[PDB]
Structure formats: structure tokens, C-alpha cells
Amino acid sequence: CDIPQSTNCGGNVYSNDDINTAIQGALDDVAXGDRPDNYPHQYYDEASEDITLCCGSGPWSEFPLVYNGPYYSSRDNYVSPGPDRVIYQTNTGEFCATVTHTGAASYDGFTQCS
């Protein structure tokens, strides 16, 4: 669906520009910058969690949602992905959701941003 004007991920408020920047960073697989280590990766939708995706069928991918993005990291120059993520449709780039590890059932769990 359309990227929302704002999202609140456990107290970190991100704009539509932040979200678009994350998706475009995820999709930037052309040679120069390098793609980040470990991202984007497949998003695994957990049946016991309550995440609502607004993009229809998978496959889905997940990329870190950070300020002044896009996220980058490597083992040599590491930056935490932090708790916040954008989920997008791997093949179309369509926005699906923003989710966060903040306030989740466990360290690896997700809850939906608002």
C-alpha cells in the first residue's frame, strides 16, 4: 500500500521519506556503494504474532529503518540495524509494513509500528 506519512516504532517516529529511503536502499543492487551485510533479507511472518501486511502476496523482504538512511553495515565497519524495520514486497518494492523489536514478546519478536 502507500507509504504512510508517519510511523511510530516503539517511540521512534519515522517519516514517509525515511521509509522510502529504506526501501530504495534495500533495492539498490547496482555497482558503485556495497549492499549492507545481512540486509535486505527474507521477512518471516510469525503466525503467533499479529503483523498486518498491506502489500498482498509474498515474497517479502525486511530492511532496517533508520534515521538519515539508508542503513549500511559490514563486518569491518559495523552498525547495528537497531530495532526497527520496513517490510516490502521483494519483487515489486511495494511497501508492506513497519515493524519493531521494541516492546515485542522476546528479543527476536516483532510488534507492528503504529
Residue numbers in the known binding site are 29-32, 37, 39-49, 85, 108-110
Q: How many helices (H) and strands (E) does the chain have?
A: 1, 7
| 26 among known catalytic residues | no
One character per residue 13-32, x = contact with K ion (rule: CB under 5 A):
---------------x----
| 41 among known catalytic residues | yes
Alpha helix (H) residue ranges in 12-54:
16-27
Whole-number Å distance between alpha carbons of 100 and 90: 19
> Which CB sits closer to K ion, 16 or 35?
35
Residue 46 touches K ion, criterion: CB under 5 A: no
